[PDB]
Amino acid sequence: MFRNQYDNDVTVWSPQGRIHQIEYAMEAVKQGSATVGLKSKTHAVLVALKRAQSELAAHQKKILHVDNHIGISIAGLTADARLLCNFMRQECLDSRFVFDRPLPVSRLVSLIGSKTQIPTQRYGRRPYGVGLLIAGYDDMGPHIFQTCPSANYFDCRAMSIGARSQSARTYLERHMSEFMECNLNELVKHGLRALRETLPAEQDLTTKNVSIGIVGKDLEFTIYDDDDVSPFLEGLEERP
Amino acid sequence: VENILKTLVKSCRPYFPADATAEMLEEWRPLMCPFDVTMQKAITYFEIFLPTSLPPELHHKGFKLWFDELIGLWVSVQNLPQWEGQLVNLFARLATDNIGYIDWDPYVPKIFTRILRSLNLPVGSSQVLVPRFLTNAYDIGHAVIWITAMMGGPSKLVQKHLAGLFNSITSFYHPSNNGRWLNKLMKLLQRLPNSVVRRLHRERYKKPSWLTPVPDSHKLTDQDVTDFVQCIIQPVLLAMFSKTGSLEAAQALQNLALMRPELVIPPVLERTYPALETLTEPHQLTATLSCVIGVARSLVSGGRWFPEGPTHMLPLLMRALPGVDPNDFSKCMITFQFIATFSTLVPLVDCSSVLQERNDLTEVERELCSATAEFEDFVLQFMDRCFGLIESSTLEQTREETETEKMTHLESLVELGLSSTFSTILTQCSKEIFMVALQKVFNFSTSHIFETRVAGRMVADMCRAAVKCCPEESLKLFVPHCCSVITQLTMNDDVLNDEELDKELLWNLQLLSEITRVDGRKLLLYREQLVKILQRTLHLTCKQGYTLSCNLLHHLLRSTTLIYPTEYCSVPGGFDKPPSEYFPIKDWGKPGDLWNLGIQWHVPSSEEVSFAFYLLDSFLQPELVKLQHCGDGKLEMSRDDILQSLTIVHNCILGSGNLLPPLKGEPVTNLVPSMVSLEETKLYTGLEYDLSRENHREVIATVIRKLLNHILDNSEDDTKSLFLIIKIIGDLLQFQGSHKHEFDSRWKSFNLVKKSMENRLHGKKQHIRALLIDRVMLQHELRTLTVEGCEYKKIHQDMIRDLLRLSTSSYSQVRNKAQQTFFAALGAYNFCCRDIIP
Amino acid sequence: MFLTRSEYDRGVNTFSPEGRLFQVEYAIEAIKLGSTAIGIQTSEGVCLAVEKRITSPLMEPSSIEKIVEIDAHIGCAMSGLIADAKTLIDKARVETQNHWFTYNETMTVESVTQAVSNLALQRPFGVALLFGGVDEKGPQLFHMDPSGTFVQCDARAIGSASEGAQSSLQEVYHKSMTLKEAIKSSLIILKQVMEEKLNATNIELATVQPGQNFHMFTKEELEEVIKDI
Amino acid sequence: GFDRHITIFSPEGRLYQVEYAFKAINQGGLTSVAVRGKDCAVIVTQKKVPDKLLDSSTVTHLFKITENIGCVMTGMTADSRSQVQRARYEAANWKYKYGYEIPVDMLCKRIADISQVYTQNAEMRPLGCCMILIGIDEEQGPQVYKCDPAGYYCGFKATAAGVKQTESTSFLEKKVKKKFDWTFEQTVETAITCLSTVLSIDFKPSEIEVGVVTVENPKFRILTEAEIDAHLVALAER
Amino acid sequence: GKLVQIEYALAAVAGGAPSVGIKAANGVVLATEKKQKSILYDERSVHKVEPITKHIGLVYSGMGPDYRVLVHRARKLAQQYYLVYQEPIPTAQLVQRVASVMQEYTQSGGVRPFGVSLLICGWNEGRPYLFQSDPSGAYFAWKATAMGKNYVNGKTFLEKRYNEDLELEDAIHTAILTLKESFEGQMTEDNIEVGICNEAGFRRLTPTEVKDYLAAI
Amino acid sequence: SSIGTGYDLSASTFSPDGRVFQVEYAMKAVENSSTAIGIRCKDGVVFGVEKLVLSKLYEEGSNKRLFNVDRHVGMAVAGLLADARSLADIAREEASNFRSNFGYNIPLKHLADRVAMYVHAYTLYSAVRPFGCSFMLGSYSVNDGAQLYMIDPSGVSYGYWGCAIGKARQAAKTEIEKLQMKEMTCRDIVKEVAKIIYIVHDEVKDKAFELELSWVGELTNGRHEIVPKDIREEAEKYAKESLK
Structure with a gap:
């Protein structure tokens, strides 16, 4: 009823000078669970919330290791993240x-x-x-x-x-x-x-x-999961 | 034969004897065995013959006798048999004929379920298909008549069920959920409003007749029409954006707008304004604009229930102006139709001054007068957009070997649309608005030189349209400039010998030829200038440039020798009125009155006919004398000279066909013999031929036969000359100033305009003045074209034998053209075919 | 019931305005409509139970196998056509041996499931697989989605009635469950979805235990287990 | 049907996209005139610098394909540069492969052959540009050749490209039909008069750019503003 | 559709300039109309009738850029045969090879079929040969053929004029007459291009030679 | 109005009017972007861009719109950053190839032509969309003086004494026109470029911006470099006082 002729492909440019498919892909990250990353003078920390299919299911892994000095947290399609993670690991090993x-x-x-x-x-x-x-x-x-x-x-x-x-x-x-x-x-x-x-x-x-x-x-x-997160979690105050 | 027989029985069914129904039942009741095939024969006869058009007093003699048995069979037969389709058609006819005399309510739930089943919509995961469900095929047209017939009366069950049907299938109407079901669903949407508008017309605006009137109790109340529009409006609005195309939605909206403008016009307008602005959603613009054409008559003149009414018209027209563009043909055509429909309905005259001088105007009328100030801006902007389309429509030949020299169907359609829309805008324009427009067209055409094949034809058509609206002023600017440029260019005298003329000369010759068609009296003032131009140009050797001059002769002769209606205006004698004598906003919309149409007709004057004869003597007679010499062994002339002379003669026959009397000769002696007289019908058709003057058609016939004998004997390879001879023989045999092909195109255009501008609820009593003038012209064209009972005659026999000689010629191209003319001639003369067969 | 189609559905590699890929989602759902397979992981062992659904008496029951051995310590239960999963099962078997040649060691179930997921990524793939095996960590069960997501599941059900079976599995499952109890529970849940008396042709049961290799219960062994129910 | 969208045959037998490419040449709004005299060939094009900020030297439609060959490009500028680069490569390759400088006729054929490929294949749009090549042929004297988006090429005594090409060709035809072989001054005068008449500009030296090749000096030379002014002032005093 | 594209390609050939081929006992004549649109065009710059080999020549009606691609391929095919067999290629063999290239363009997708029909004249083994190749890739052997505008009218005129035994000189005259029938204006040596094939081999008649034949007619 | 014909869908299609719509649409993307201003002075060329800061969380220097494509040449970009970064990578590669093959730094005017042709290639094929960025390449050498060239999405490249790309391209151009770049040295020009950027910026439409200034000149010894922070701060102070 309100169909857009310009959103079919990433190649097509809209008359308003916007590529709709890129904008739609940008929304894909919002589908993924929240991940927070912050840094200090000496340390950089990524904290992410995982979600599970069932109580029996383990929980999906948001954070991944790329190199000894580099780590990443994924939000959005997991398959794309696995392709990017493999590329990043190869570049680091090559360096x-x-x-x-x-x-x-x-x-x-x-x-x-x-x-x-x-x-x-x-x-x-x-x-x-x-x-x-x-x-x-x-x-x-x-x-x-x-x-x-x-x-x-x-x-x-x-x-x-x-x-x-x-x-x-x-x-x-x-x-x-x-x-x-x-x-x-x-x-x-x-x-x-x-x-x-x-x-x-x-x-x-x-x-x-x-x-x-x-x-x-x-x-x-270092990725801290399950019992490892407990020392960090114990210090946090109760929700305001 | 089957269709003609079925209509014949249906035609005599109202006049069948009173006791006929009982005897008809006795004859076909035995054949009604459900297992046997004779059940279908029995039902088929019952649908065709049983009389439902019987007076209410004699209802017992007819419908009462079989209604219970046939309706009972219909509810009982759960399997869908072939006869059920015939049975539903009979019930729909009975319901419409006897609106208030049948209960209907006991069977209403079953009918709505069977109609819903007929649509075959898919529901459920399994979606299994059962054979013969498609075969029953309850027709949408008959079902719509049945639903409309049971509507009204104290019971509201039918309206409640109709809302339920629409509410159940709304998802299918959505554009995304397209499929096989859409064709029937779209048909239901278009037919149901048409049936309701027809029923209301019969009940409210139709004259009383022998046919029984709807009982007042069962007449649809205003609340019933309000309920119907509310139920169908939501499905129609989704159908507007349907991938199928929105024609069905536009027709449905047109009927709904007549019944209730306030409920239907605003939702379509709410979508239309965004659709014009949107750049990312192209489909909406065509769909919304087409729907606005459908409700156009209602919005411009409807203020009782839609007070805003016309205020929306001026903004919509300005917003649609970007729509004319070279890039999109469909948007350009829909925009042209939109601009033409609104322009014909609205007088384009500024009345802003009236607000200050006169008070007592309604608040809406005051806004309308303030809006009229922008009308001049709209016309000039339309011309600016049109000039751009013409500039980007240049043919630009890309092949070194050949030149296209032709118009594609798409470019022909844009030329036709631009010419029609511009003509409507100018006709409704006030003289002050027209004069600024005249200067703009004159400057654009005069300033630039255009290719004659495509862009030049479009510029000339815009200029021709301007000349028609006000001929004295337009011809005064156009005729001297075109003549002066041509005379200056042709002064060398080696121009006549030259092959390939100056492009400026070619353009001015095209412009002069096209502007020439107009009221004949106006052409007479410049008669001397036109003859001088024709004398030098007609004998130019270049094929293009003698064709353009020959077109000028044909147009000049046609303008002075034919009966045609000059004004074609929405308001009789209007738009030139002294300011404040006539108020335009009152006449917005407003249908013309047949009695007060006041059509202005150009009837050939004595001076015009004398000029036409002088032109025929000046140009046709010299070519005829040379052609006669060439037929004899004298004045041997080149194939190109013969073709040029034949072009001159053919254009003269076409231009003066009405003036030249039909060929006459002694009748062929051997023919079928009839005791009763066999006389050709005679129709006056105006004009009255001049008996004293020698018939040019007779002199053309003798020379053409002589030339044909010479060409076939000697220059048999002159295909181009032979094609012209075939055309001349056809014109000599059957031309009276009207072309059959032209009539057919105009008739189709009349039907196409009529559908958009016809108010079914109020009937033919309200019709736009321009279409009514066209219908009177079509009737005059019908009289000239219809010739029946013509005697075969010796002259016709000789021309038909000559057509047969060309039809058996060595070249297949000559044979094909001759054969088509030969077939056309055989039908015209009585008993002609039997003589030709040996 | 009624059609509910949107313009952005069925667009192949086109993101919807929300950012979801609708054609991929529809394909994944169609893949999950195969025969029910139940896996329960216990400290004693990992058990996989599937429904054979043989069409005719003449057909040999062994020819239709929904449980396959990737390696001695790893077994896979599949829902849907065996033909769709043949390429993926082969990749896992080739990788397990390729790993053994390169590193002289068994491959953990998580690493095996990751390799099959990589093949699926390199495209829905048309199968849902349950990989159950005992590795260095211990008895472990992994679920591979048609999308290619792999998660460790204590108990997982894949197939036409997986959602109902998973609710039943959640209530019955406890961390201290013995392998014998797990076999009974999975078969009881399988009987409820099947609504058919359990017989050797109807169900195929396999278990991987820490000392033992992959074992598929023989007709006599299954008959003893079904009779106890 | 996609007949209009891509270069495939229409029902009439015409390829619309090539016709649309011809429309693109006019879209630039500039006109180029080339005239072949007895001993020389000259090219004149209107040069418009829209902004004072733009450097005048950078804006040019006259290019040197080879030392003895120069061209004028009418149409989309980026497409023009693409054709100019292809022509320069083709000319160098010909000298390397055959040991003699490419003839102007042969170079026009090579560019036209590349142009035909675009018309046959749907993936690549035709280039919306016209190339007029001027050079001195040792065997046949001064030569002017024009290449089209359609892939057609022809040698011309005089030719025009651009918005005023139809009007320019008409002025040139009259001079060619009458008159005689023209000297270098007359040939430069004919081109400048033709452009001046069609555009009614009374060009100052800055507005027009002139390129010339002569039998005496075969190398392509772009006249300096002072040289163009000398021709313009002589035309004014006549 | 590929078949529809072939029909559309045939239409472009029909719109193309008239070309006539006549086969006579001692030679084949190929004639074409080359009317330059303006006095500006240089007549000698471009030639419609082109030699493929010493004994083979071709003419076309239709799109000229498309024709050039075929002439390059035809010239290459003739050379490839000469290298392998050290003998001039038989004309029938060349037409079969040229036809295959046109078929490849119709079969392939993303490429329009050629819009040019080719008339090929050759002399091998002391026998004249004349052939026509279509955009479809079909080839036929013709004693006389006309292609381009008014081809149907030209072919019927050829039927009356053609005689089974004719000298090449007489054949040249009838070919010029066929072009004259559909020539809009005066025919001059520059306006018409004529090529003759004989035992000597294909040659394009010089404008001076064309002038003499035109004067005789 | 809106065209549903589909001529505008591909850069491999010409409209009946004669225009490729996809290249026109791509240019609109550059217009909907922060203005970038380049002015060429007798000493050398200075580039200034207004870099909108979307979030305080982003570090300063994120999403740089000024890139060093060679030791002597620098690029100012507008439009989609990802496309512009890709164009910068191609420009660096072409400059590297020229140095290795010909043994000297690429002449700006040849780098511009080579990059412009790559952008043009995207405009002629169905598979690849036209680039959505417009950039200014600037350089200085003793042999060749300060050079500024602008390449649009169409691929047309011209040399400009002063140039602007972005939303305020016309407004910046009018401000640049009222200046004497030819007789003005680079140090004076930097203060003026900051003034032009402050005037063009709309505070209501765009809440915050960071001025990025780079110059290549005789003073920089023919090396493209960011204008030093102390000089940039002085220019910002002059610009803010001028706006008052």
Whole structure:
């Protein structure tokens, strides 16, 4: 009844100078569960809330390892995230083999941006439906990066992606000044609090539903799940 | 034979004897065995013969006798048999004929279930298909008559059931849920409003007759019409955006708007304004605009229930102006139809001054007068958009070897649409608005030179339309400039010898030829200039440039020798009135009156006919004398000279066909013999031929026969000359100033305009003045075209034998053209075929 | 019941305005309409139970097998045509041996399910698979969706009545369940969906235990288990 | 039917997309005139710099395909640059493969052959540009050749391209029918008068760009504004 | 549709300039109309009638850029046969090869069929050969043929004029007469291009030679 | 109004009017983007862009619209950033190829032509959409003076003394026209470029922007570089005072 002739393909440009399919793909990240990433002077932490098909089911893994110094959290289509994760792991291993140097995180995010851009400009290709929050430590320092289905990438002091992400972003912006000087324990607590804002009032963060990944000057990327998240979870105050 | 016989019995069924129904039942009641095939024969006879048109007093003699038995069989037969379709058709006829004399309510739930089953909509996961469900095929047309017939009366069961049917199938009407079911569903949407509007016309606006009137108790109340529109409006609005195309929705809206404009016009308008603005949703614009054409008559003149009414017309027309464009043909054509329909309905005159001078106008009328100020902006902007379409429509030949020299059907349609829309805008324009328009067309055509094949034809048509609206002023600017450019260019005198003329000369010759067609009296003032141009141009060697001059002669002769209606205006004698003498906003919409139509007819004057004879003597007679010499062994002339001379003669026959009397000769002696007289019918058709002057048609016939004998004997390879001879023999045999093909196209156009501008509820009493003038012209054209009973004659026999000689010629192309003319001639003369067969 | 179609449904590789891919979703649902397969994972062992649905007495029951052995320690239960899953079952079997040649070791069930998922990604794939095996971690059960998502499930049901079976499975399942109790529960749930008396032709039962390799119960062994119910 | 959308045959037998490509050449709004004299060939095109900010040197429609061959491009500018690059490559390849400079007629055929491929294949749109190549042929004297989006090419005594091509061709036809072989000054005068008459501009030296090749100096030369002014002032005093 | 595209391609050939081929005992004559649209066009710059080999020549009615692609392929096919067999290619063999290329364009998708019909004249084994190839890829052997505008009228005129035993000189005159029937204006040596095939081999008659034949007619 | 014919759908199609709509639509995408201004001075070329900051959470320097495509040449972009970044990658590759094959830095005017042809290639095929970005390439050398070239989505590249791409392209152009770039040195130009950016920016339509300034000149020794922060701060102070 209100059909649009210009939304059929990523190649078609609308008369308003917008590509509709890229915008539709950008909405795919919002379908995925909320993920919060924040950084301090010495550490970068990604905190994500997993969801499960059934009580018996284990829970999907939002956070993945890319390299010793780089870790990513996925929101949006999981299959696209697996393709991107495999590409990122190969680039990092190549950098260690050729230069014996951890690949700078900024160069990796640029390569992901190039790979994502080609589906947007070519026929019969869907733009990737996954948004990635990337946590890394390099010579420059701890870095948090956001990638979009549009192929744009952003350096962020802190970012939240997924459903109800805006509530987390309002908390992250409110307390961002405190984040730079925070110790690892406090920085993780701030991320859990932002993720808590996304959660509905009845639901609360649990060891089963929360995944935390932290990279730092002396810490290789480590994913803490289930019992491992319990020390970080115990410190957090009760929901306001 | 079957269809003619079925209509014949149906025609005599109202006049059958009173006791006929009882005897008909006795004859076909034995054949009614359900298992036997004779049941179908019995039902078929019952549908064709049983009389439902009997007076209420004699109802016992007819319908009462069989209604219970046949209706009982229909409810009882759960399997769908072939006869059920015939049975439902009979019930629908009975219901419409006896509106208030049948209960209907006991059987109403079953009928609605069987009609819903007929649509064969898919429901449920299994969706199994049962054979013979498709075969029953309850017809939508008969079902719609049955539903409309049972509507009305104290009981509201039928209206409640109709709402239930529409509520149940609404999802199917949605554009996304398209499928096989859409064809029947769309037919239901278009037919049901048409039936209700017809029923209301019979009850309220139809003259009383022997046929029984609807009982006042069962007459549809205003609430009943309000309920019907509310039930069907939501499905119709979804159907407007249907992928099928929205023709069915537009027709349904047109009927609904007559019944209740306030309920139906605003929802369509709410969609139309966004559709014009949207850039990402193209389909909406065509669908919404077509629906606005359907409700156009209601919105412009309807203020009682739709007070806003005409206020919306001016904004919509301006918003549609971007629609004319080279890129989209369909948008351009729908926009042209939209601009033409509104323009014909609305007098395009500014009355903004009236608000200050006179008070007491209604608040809506005051807004209308303020809006009239922008009418001049709209016409000039339409011309600006049209100039762009013409500029981007240049043929631009890309092949070095050949030139296209032709118009594609799509470009012909855009030229026809642009010409028609521009003509309507100018005819309704006030003289002050027209004069600014005249300068704009004159400057555009004069300033630039255009290719004659496509763009030039379109520019000339816009210029020709401007000349028709006000001939004295338009000819005064156009005729001198075109003549001056042609005379200056042709002064060299080597131009006549040159092959390939100056493009400017070719354009001015096309412009002069097209502007020429108009009232003959107007052409007379410039008669001397036109003859001088014709004398130099007619003998130009170039094929293009002598054709254009020959077209000028044909148009000049046709304009002065034919009877045609000049005004074609919405309001009689209007738009030139002194300001404040006539108020235009009152005449918005407003149907013309047949008695007060005041059609202005051009009847050939004595001066015009004398000029036509002078032109025929000046040009046709010199070519005829050369052609006669060529037929004899004298004045040998080139094939190109013969073709040029034949072109001159053919154009003269076409231009003056009405003036030249029909060929006459002694009748063929051997023919079938009849005791009763066999006389050709005679119709006056105006004019009255001049007996004293020698018949040019007779002199053309003698020379053409002589030339044919010479060409076949000597230059048998001159195919181009032979084609012209075939055309001339056809014109000599059957031309009286009207072309059969032209009449057919005009008749179809009259039917096409009539459907959009016809108010079924109020009947023919309200019809637009322009269409009524066209119908009177069509009747005059019918008289000239209809010739019956003509005697075969010796002259016709010789021409038909000559057509047969061409029909057996060496070249297949000559044979094909001759054979079509030969077949046409055989029908015209009585007993002609029997003589030709040996 | 009534058709409910939207313009963005059935668009192949086109994102809907919401960002969902509707044609992929419809395809995944059609794939999950196959025969019911139930897997329960217990500390003692992992048990897989499936319904054979043989059409005729003449047909040999063994020829239709819905439970296959990827390797000695891994078995797979499939819902839907065996032909659709043949390529994926083959990939898992080839990978398990390819891993053994390269690293001289057994491949964990999670790694095996990931390899089958990678083939599915490289396209709905048309099958839902339950991989049950005992690895270094212990007895473990994984569910592979037609989409290709793989999760570890303590108890999972795939097939026409999977949603009903999963609710029944949730109530019956407990972490301390013994393998013998698990076999009885899965067969009891399978009987309820089937609404047919359980017989050797009707159901196929396989178990992988820590000491033992993949074992498919023989007709006599199944008959003893069904009689106890 | 997609007959209008892609380069496939219409029911009439015509390819509309090539006709649309011809419309594109006029879309630029600039006109080029080329005249062949007894000893020389000259090209004149109108140059319009819309903004004062634009550098005048950068905006040009006259290009050097080879030392002895120069061209004028009418139509979409980016499409024009694409054809100019292809022609330059073809000319270099011909000298490398055959050891002699490509004839102007042969170069026009090569570009026209590339143009035919676009008309036959649906995936690639035809290029909306016209190439007029001027050069001195050692054997046949001064040569002017024009290539079309249709893939047609022909040699012309005089030719025009652009919005005023139909009007320009009419002025040129009259001069060609009468008169005689023209000297270099007359040939430059004929081109400038033709462009001036059709566009009614009374061009200042900055408005027009002139390219010339002569039997005496075969190399393509673009006249300086002062040289164009000398021709313009001589035309004014006549 | 591929078949509809072939019918549409045939229409373009019919709209093309008239071309006439006549086969006589000692030679084949191929004649075409080449009317330059303006005095501006240089008549000698482009030739409608082109040699494929010493003994083979071709003419066309239809789109000229499409014709050029075929002439390059035809010239290549003739050379490939010469290299392998060291003998001039038989005309029938060349027409079969040229036809296959046209069939490939109709069969393939994303490519329109050629819009040109080819008339091929050759002399091999002391016998004249004349053939016509269609956009469809069909080839026929013709004693006389006319293609392009007024082809049907031209072919009927050819039927009356053609005699089984005719000299090439007489054949050239009738071919010019066939073009004259459908020539809109005066025919001049520049306006018409004529090519003759004989034992000597295909040659394009020089404008001076054409002038002499035109004067005799 | 709206066209449903489908001529506008592909860049492999010509409309009956004679225009490729997809290239026209892509240009509109550049127009709906923050203005980028480039001015060429006798000493060299300075580029200034207004980079809208969508969120405080983003770090400064995110989504840079100024890129270094070579040691001597820098690029200012408008329109879709992802397409512009892809065009920057092609430009860096072409410059690298020129240095390896010919042994010297690519002349701007040849880099512009090579990149412009790549953008044009996208405009002629059904499979690939036209690029949605417009960019200005600027460079300086002793042998060749300051050069500024702008390439549009169509692929037409021209040299401009002053150029603007974006929503306020006309407004920026009028401000640039009232200046004497030819007789003005680069240091004076930087202050003016900041002034032009502040005037073009609409606070109500766009809440916040970060001015990004880069220059290549005799002072930079023919190296494209960001204008130093201290100089950028001085220019911003002059621009803010001028707006008052």
